[PDB]
Amino acid sequence: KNRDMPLDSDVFRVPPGYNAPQQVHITQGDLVGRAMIISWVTMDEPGSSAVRYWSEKNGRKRIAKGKMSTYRFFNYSSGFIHHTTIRKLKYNTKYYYEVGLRNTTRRFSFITPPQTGLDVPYTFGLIGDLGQSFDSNTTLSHYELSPKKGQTVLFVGDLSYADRYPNHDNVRWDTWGRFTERSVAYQPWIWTAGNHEIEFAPEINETEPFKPFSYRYHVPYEASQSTSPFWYSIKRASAHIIVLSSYSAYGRGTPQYTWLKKELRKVKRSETPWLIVLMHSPLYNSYNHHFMEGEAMRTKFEAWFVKYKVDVVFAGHVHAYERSERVSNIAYKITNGLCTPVKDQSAPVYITIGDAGNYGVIDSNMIQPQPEYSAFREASFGHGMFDIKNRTHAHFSWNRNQDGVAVEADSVWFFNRHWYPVDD
Amino acid sequence: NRDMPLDSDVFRVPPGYNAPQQVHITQGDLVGRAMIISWVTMDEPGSSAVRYWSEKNGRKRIAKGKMSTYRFFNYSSGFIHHTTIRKLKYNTKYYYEVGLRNTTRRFSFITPPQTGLDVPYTFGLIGDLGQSFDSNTTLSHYELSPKKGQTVLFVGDLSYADRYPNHDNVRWDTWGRFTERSVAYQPWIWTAGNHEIEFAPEINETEPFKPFSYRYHVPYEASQSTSPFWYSIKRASAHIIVLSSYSAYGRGTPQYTWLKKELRKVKRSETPWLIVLMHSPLYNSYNHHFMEGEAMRTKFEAWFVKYKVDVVFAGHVHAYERSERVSNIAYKITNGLCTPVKDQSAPVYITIGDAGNYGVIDSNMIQPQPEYSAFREASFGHGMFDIKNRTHAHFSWNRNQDGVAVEADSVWFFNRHWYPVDDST
Amino acid sequence: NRDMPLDSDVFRVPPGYNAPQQVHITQGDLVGRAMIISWVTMDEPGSSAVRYWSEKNGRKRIAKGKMSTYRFFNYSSGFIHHTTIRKLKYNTKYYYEVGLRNTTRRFSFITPPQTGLDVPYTFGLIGDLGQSFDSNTTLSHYELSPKKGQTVLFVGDLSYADRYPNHDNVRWDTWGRFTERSVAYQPWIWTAGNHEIEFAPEINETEPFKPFSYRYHVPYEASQSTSPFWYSIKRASAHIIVLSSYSAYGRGTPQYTWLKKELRKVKRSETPWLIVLMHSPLYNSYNHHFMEGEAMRTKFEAWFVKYKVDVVFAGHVHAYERSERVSNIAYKITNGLCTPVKDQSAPVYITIGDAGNYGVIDSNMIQPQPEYSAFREASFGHGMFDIKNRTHAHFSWNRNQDGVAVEADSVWFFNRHWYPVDDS
Amino acid sequence: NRDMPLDSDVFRVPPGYNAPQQVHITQGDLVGRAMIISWVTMDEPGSSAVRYWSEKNGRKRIAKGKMSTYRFFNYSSGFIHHTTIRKLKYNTKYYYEVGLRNTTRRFSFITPPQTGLDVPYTFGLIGDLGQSFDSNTTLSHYELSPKKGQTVLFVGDLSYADRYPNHDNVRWDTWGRFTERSVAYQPWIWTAGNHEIEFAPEINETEPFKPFSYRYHVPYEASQSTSPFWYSIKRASAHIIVLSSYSAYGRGTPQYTWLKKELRKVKRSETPWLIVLMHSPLYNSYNHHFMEGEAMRTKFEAWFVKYKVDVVFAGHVHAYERSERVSNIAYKITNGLCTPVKDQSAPVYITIGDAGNYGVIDSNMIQPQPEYSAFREASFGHGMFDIKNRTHAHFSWNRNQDGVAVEADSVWFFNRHWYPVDD
């Protein structure tokens, strides 16, 4: 009945040694990819926030200094959380970095992306609603073993699922930290905030939304002049990635709404032709679980996505896989009867990819019959891959946990909305 | 530029060293036995103590409150006092004094009757007031009304200070001195509008609602809300729910969670009249801000129908509108059911955002008038929601161009719980 | 090391889920009508509500206080509760309950009589207590005394946790559980000693007095002090001034300014007995900490004489000493007058820092005994300051090696204001 | 009274929208390679950036700092900028600009030589300046000294704003505009005095040193202090220790702990001139504040003799005094030894708090002159401590009533480490 991996699972083991860094993770730390946020936890004493790093070829060893913090949540006290931004990195260079410089040093590595550009290829993993059940471990293995070979994960929210435990037992953030480390210590994960990150629990006097998640997973939101960690953009290779918060305000005149309207004007499709939006709650979703929860955001932002010709919108939240047709539903005017989606070659494809495991439960009840806006849907565990070839073509595939690591149960060519708007 | 100039009589500084100014009150508890007393001192911090006594008991007590200050760009505020008087007697006239240390000023208010089934009560409805000459006329029409408003339900957009350069917060101070002649003597129930957001990254002011939330306090914890921007009060026979159009309301957010559990706590056997206040109207056939209320409608409209809300008041559109009782809660993306229909279980939606703002009326309407809209007109004015008993409340809309006793629109509400009968005009 | 082990009986954890522990009370206002109720819960934050009733009227009432936490290096505190009960009736037994949500525990205390000229009261005097076995024997002698102390005047150095590695704040927890059998039932008046400073920059803990000040609250605002470390209370016929040896006391500083105004507020027609507490002694003829009190003496000794202070109690030296009435205030740099003289307007200075500490007595004394020193001895013990009326107070010192009713030293105090007879 | 009126020329507000005012600099690191740049903008927040370049390179760089504000009773401050420029070159003139967003103003300073055994350097000594007409005359005399002061060691009591009703902090702003003509072009080294405490509970202002600590930053973490009110710096051949008379200094306290460790780091072969600054004098034979320094003297006087401090500079007494080299550290309560004695290991104690304050001089003296006092006079003026090399430093005192080149008192300091002969 509980498919969550027990506490003594191998994926949760504590790196040995006095004050050994654990829960190590990295993410892009600037707007174009010359910087990296390095994050980790030490449990025995505060320790140093210094990060030692060097490129595998030059080898001059540099130190970066960051910041230490802690938080409480009901009767849980966190370890000592470190966040340190390494900057001015060279493009397309393998770096080594070390954490724990005062006591037990641990060494990792990452490869910086190429410089942003029109035809730069890059491979993104899509993972949503991961959790720490056995299905979660299989998904992460299927991603690590992908022959497509993913270089950055776009994570569309719902991370540890710790809020399911009594009092949100934040020990389950620590176990998730150690479990995902074997991926996100070596390549950036791009964080979207889901509903399991809100952790609004007034009954135990914890009413600050996103508190544990926000303390543990930093994002470079200032780099795109956002005033909140929960919405932001980054550019990587030939992609411009916009990260939105389903569970923050997006009313007209609110900060998120203001930021996004202004951020879409800065997109340059001749520098980054692939325009990608991440959000947690899907705007198009023909499952019963969470059906039409995305309507509110859709009324605010769908016309914008069409007007600026977003290529693809990735969401999670529904524990299943779905791929829409290119449609829009933006002609409604209350009394004009125009409330059915139509094909629209200026509209993104919406993909739901919230099926990486969560706590062991798949969403299988679909609306019937399958609506026209729904191109493909299936209730199986898996992950996605968005493989950009060049300015016109990107190949998307869905890998199921029950198939071999090189089998795509679904696959579609994306034809760029700016450089190549062919029907797909 | 129809805003009143700085040396207008309504803006005068009360005389005397450190005379309290911008005095205002609002309900300070869930049921009406408390008042939050608020004012500003400009010359020095002064005391936060409030001396108060009832006309009959005569015993003079002291309440102690708190002082705060804020900055916004290159404006620094004076000294803001918030003091809550508690454990008052119902239906009792009280005097209170502020500015104990140097220049004292005396005012009065009348606590509401105890909450009960047939308790009559007359609520003013004012939205988008601003500080134009139109604003002053409306306030004059409200205070001279023959129906005698006892509480103002204020549906957002207060000072419009954010239209001035750097949101020149002096225009918050002027508005507090203007409105004082009403809100020092009777509560105003505050809803946050978009002019209260004051999100201004270009001058490093990124904290939404900061001036408003410093100047106007609400009893939000009394309904176990975690934020000033949504909360609930009961007063006489009304249960009043105040929502924030410019806060989060997705599933699982604080305001969504609070609202869902707040609706369950409404007892129509105790407070018959269920009133919702918000700034952006769910139903609005004017072109200005057309369909901006759609996002909140998708989350909450079915909840309003399920709980048989009597009336939803909003502002934002600078005009007046009264809807039919309608719902639009059957849409399923592909089924074509996106037209509102008559629904006796649904509230009446009233836009009342025509109190004056900076002097501009919203006249462009969508033609012809849709079936869902009962009455609309692009004129300045205000409203009165006059509860008679558990079955009947009389709503009336008064225009600034008419005399203060003339109702250009008028409807008898049949209470959705105790008199669930078609009340359309 | 003579510190009692962690498994000692005195350190037992009260049973039951989130049972309040480390329960301590102190006077909560200026005149004795309020009490600060303090305790720690370990399993979860719990309620800060205190339920209380007098013996006389038996009406249960609720007072609500505040919860707080702190960190010190790699230690995290439990949940600390401070709640003030007010409007208590004079000379009256109260019962109070803490832990209202899970495991409740009930205690009692007796308010002092109203302040007046001739109101009798017995103050205990305990200094540099620690948690050695010697500390336990002192505490036992106090609670078994036939003199029956009604309040402890505590002259500083509490737990000595700062002697443990990283000041192991677990040893504050043990001390609170150990002292509870006394301070849960009668107020202790806190003075801050040097072991409470805990200035440890080498582990980035630089806020002076931080652990002490979170765990032990004083009614400092009731005498218009701006700092917990100096303040005044009145109780029965006593006006008690508590001073901070390790805060600033230069001319113009907060402590200096507060003390100058506060001596002018003493009304000996209401509280005849004027008592000053401080950690470091102004008159001390032992070698350990010899002359460390000179700095405060230069600043405050002439004030104590001018305001006819009856007695100054201090700790810091791990032994007992009682001075004659002397002053050393005629010094003008070049006039040679630096010898203390008998001055029947001066206080008696008493060192009483011998309650046990970590098991070490200070036995090195300057020989021969100076004329200013009336009696001194290197033995563990405590004091009793037993007020009879406005003229007469009996002070006695009890040694840990004697019977609980044996006074190894005693002296009648004749009040400096109401009865200035030679009491040599 | 005798304070200069608000419309005086020294108080004039620099013109242009949001033009920086109250510009002041101080040393920014331990050894002299850094400078803290400080200033106020009144019209809006503005930029905290400082553009700077050397006269030699001309490569203009930018350093970014921080903006802060404070209230005090019914006063609200302007926007206070502190920005630290680092990696400066030794012995080099730099220009710097503040006010980059609207009205830019330009200044300059000259970095000190690198620290060394025989490095000459000329220090000014000012205490208790205030803003009376007397204060302006002392500043003029300092600016016009033929010895050319390169840094001011300032021993406390700055604006005397706390004498006005509610400490009227406008009188901090004016003092900032008045002193700028000096402290914008050379560091002043800041010591906290009693008029900086501003403990005013009757108007609910209880944070000690608040207005001063907002407006004047020091490089206290460079010497591993945890408080701005005590710290050290090295400059040329001087090691300078700044103490806080009005902070705690009992055994085990932060300032006590810091001073005992700091004295162990002193290297007389790198900086042979060991200098202590404090506000309250440990030696003082005037009736005003007589013996107020006794408490700090019980704690620190033996450390000064032990480490052979050359000179201790203090203010607070509104006059001038130069002690003999004496110590008074033998007292043991009953041994009777409480008279100071000639001590060639001891520093000279100079009271130099006569720079003007609000117009009033302290003229009552203990009579007769004690053996431990060498020279004392109740006149307005300032001091100069002129280091020639590791053995010789010339101290001069200049009175406001004399010519700017006249030294009414002067003495040769022989270094206690390198040349401890009777002076």
Ligand SMILES: *[C@@H]1O[C@H](CO)[C@@H](O[C@@H]2O[C@H](CO)[C@@H](O)[C@H](O)[C@H]2NC(C)=O)[C@H](O[C@@H]2O[C@@H](C)[C@@H](O)[C@@H](O)[C@@H]2O)[C@H]1NC(C)=O
């Ligand atoms: C806080 O830091 C202390 C200093 O490192 C910890 O004590 C050290 O723990 C080591 C185990 O990792 C042990 O080898 C060292 O001997 C010991 N050092 C000293 C000076 O005692 C302390 O760890 C606690 O105590 C030890 C004995 C273990 O039992 C730990 O499990 C304890 O938690 C640290 N405490 C905490 C709460 O992190």
Ligand SMILES: *[C@@H]1O[C@H](CO)[C@@H](O[C@@H]2O[C@H](CO)[C@@H](O)[C@H](O)[C@H]2NC(C)=O)[C@H](O[C@@H]2O[C@@H](C)[C@@H](O)[C@@H](O)[C@@H]2O)[C@H]1NC(C)=O
């Ligand atoms: C962008 O990448 C696409 C995927 O690799 C290219 O399409 C592929 O081009 C191959 C030629 O190298 C061809 O065999 C494959 O069939 C084809 N794949 C698909 C799904 O069409 C694309 O190549 C250009 O466009 C195609 C349609 C042909 O015209 C080629 O001759 C072109 O080089 C790449 N486009 C660009 C601009 O590089």
Ligand SMILES: *[C@@H]1O[C@H](CO)[C@@H](O[C@@H]2O[C@H](CO)[C@@H](O)[C@H](O)[C@H]2NC(C)=O)[C@H](O[C@@H]2O[C@@H](C)[C@@H](O)[C@@H](O)[C@@H]2O)[C@H]1NC(C)=O
């Ligand atoms: C509740 O308030 C209603 C509005 O004031 C009352 O109806 C009004 O009753 C008046 C006489 O009491 C009558 O002149 C008004 O025309 C009438 N107003 C309307 C809009 O109908 C109502 O009184 C009951 O209902 C009316 C229709 C009559 O039948 C009365 O005799 C009834 O008592 C009030 N209800 C009660 C129980 O008083």
Ligand SMILES: *[C@@H]1O[C@H](CO)[C@@H](O[C@@H]2O[C@H](CO)[C@@H](O)[C@H](O)[C@H]2NC(C)=O)[C@H](O[C@@H]2O[C@@H](C)[C@@H](O)[C@@H](O)[C@@H]2O)[C@H]1NC(C)=O
């Ligand atoms: C204040 O307390 C003193 C200590 O108890 C009283 O002195 C004691 O009085 C007894 C008779 O009440 C007598 O037997 C004891 O010997 C005496 N103790 C001492 C140490 O002197 C004192 O009583 C007054 O003073 C004494 C000296 C006698 O004159 C008594 O007759 C007096 O009443 C108490 N003061 C008052 C005013 O009661």
Ligand SMILES: *[C@@H]1O[C@H](CO)[C@@H](O[C@@H]2O[C@H](CO)[C@@H](O)[C@H](O)[C@H]2NC(C)=O)[C@H](O[C@@H]2O[C@@H](C)[C@@H](O)[C@@H](O)[C@@H]2O)[C@H]1NC(C)=O
């Ligand atoms: C350090 O500076 C001192 C002051 O300038 C030097 O003393 C001065 O030396 C001059 C020529 O050497 C001589 O004309 C001056 O009268 C004399 N000033 C004084 C106040 O004595 C000092 O020179 C050395 O020291 C003195 C004592 C003599 O022995 C000279 O002959 C020495 O050169 C300078 N010391 C050093 C080490 O540079």
Ligand SMILES: *[C@@H]1O[C@H](CO)[C@@H](O)[C@H](O[C@@H]2O[C@@H](C)[C@@H](O)[C@@H](O)[C@@H]2O)[C@H]1NC(C)=O
């Ligand atoms: C504000 O109130 C206080 C207390 O009621 C008065 O003392 C003030 O009077 C002024 O301040 C005192 C200190 C004294 O100078 C008096 O003469 C002043 O008039 C009062 N302030 C004013 C401006 O009336």
Ligand SMILES: *[C@@H]1O[C@H](CO)[C@@H](O)[C@H](O[C@@H]2O[C@@H](C)[C@@H](O)[C@@H](O)[C@@H]2O)[C@H]1NC(C)=O
């Ligand atoms: C101070 O500098 C800022 C930044 O360069 C300018 O924006 C200000 O210019 C004034 O305000 C702007 C918005 C623009 O309208 C300009 O025309 C104004 O002069 C500048 N302020 C002043 C007073 O020069």
Ligand SMILES: *[C@@H]1O[C@H](CO)[C@@H](O)[C@H](O)[C@H]1NC(C)=O
């Ligand atoms: C998780 O998967 C990894 C990689 O396949 C495997 O080595 C590990 O044993 C698995 N652990 C659990 C608990 O499933």
Ligand SMILES: *[C@@H]1O[C@H](CO)[C@@H](O)[C@H](O)[C@H]1NC(C)=O
């Ligand atoms: C502050 O208060 C004093 C009186 O207490 C008044 O005279 C002065 O002008 C006030 N200053 C400001 C800036 O309000």
Ligand SMILES: *[C@@H]1O[C@H](CO)[C@@H](O)[C@H](O)[C@H]1NC(C)=O
């Ligand atoms: C506002 O209205 C009041 C009463 O109607 C009037 O006395 C006052 O002069 C008006 N002020 C204006 C229009 O500025």
Ligand SMILES: *[C@@H]1O[C@H](CO)[C@@H](O)[C@H](O)[C@H]1NC(C)=O
């Ligand atoms: C402490 O003293 C008490 C009372 O004398 C006794 O019951 C207890 O056993 C003692 N404990 C220790 C550890 O000495």
Ligand SMILES: *[C@@H]1O[C@H](CO)[C@@H](O)[C@H](O)[C@H]1NC(C)=O
């Ligand atoms: C927190 O509280 C729960 C009881 O609700 C308990 O089971 C758990 O062990 C506690 N953990 C900590 C670290 O206090």
Ligand SMILES: *[C@@H]1O[C@H](CO)[C@@H](O)[C@H](O)[C@H]1NC(C)=O
């Ligand atoms: C201050 O002194 C300067 C230089 O001596 C002079 O120019 C100025 O006029 C003086 N100002 C006042 C107010 O004395």
Ligand SMILES: *[C@@H]1O[C@H](CO)[C@@H](O)[C@H](O)[C@H]1NC(C)=O
């Ligand atoms: C604030 O700034 C504006 C220009 O940006 C200026 O005109 C105005 O007078 C300023 N106000 C204050 C109070 O400084």
Ligand SMILES: [Fe+3]
């Ligand atoms: Fe999920």
Ligand SMILES: [Fe+3]
């Ligand atoms: Fe409006």
